[PDB]
Amino acid sequence: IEEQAKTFLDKFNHEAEDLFYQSSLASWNYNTNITEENV
């Protein structure tokens, strides 16, 4: 349960190294220009 808390707070990362960073690399491109579509 505690490991299943540890690993699900580590395997959600397998759903979200992309779904953070490919939203966070996408958080970046708001800032090179006056473009809001990025925000």
b/e sequence 2-21, b meaning 16+ C-beta within 10 Å = eeeeeeeeeeeeeeeeeeee
Q: Round to the nearest angstrom and report the end-to-end CA distance of the chain.
A: 38
Tokens of 5: 């808390």
Q: Give the Cα-Cα-Cα angle 3, 13, 35 (nearest 5 degrees).
A: 155
Tokens of 17: 């190294």
Handedness of CA 23, 29, 31, 36 (dihedral sign): negative
Tokens of 6: 């540890």
Experimental method: cryo-EM
What is the C-alpha to C-alpha distance for residues 38 and 30, in angstroms, rounded to an integer? 4
Q: Residue ranges of the alpha helices (H) in 1-39? A: 2-11, 17-28
What is the C-alpha to C-alpha distance for residues 29 and 33, in angstroms, rounded to an integer? 8
Give this entry's resolution in angstroms. 4.5
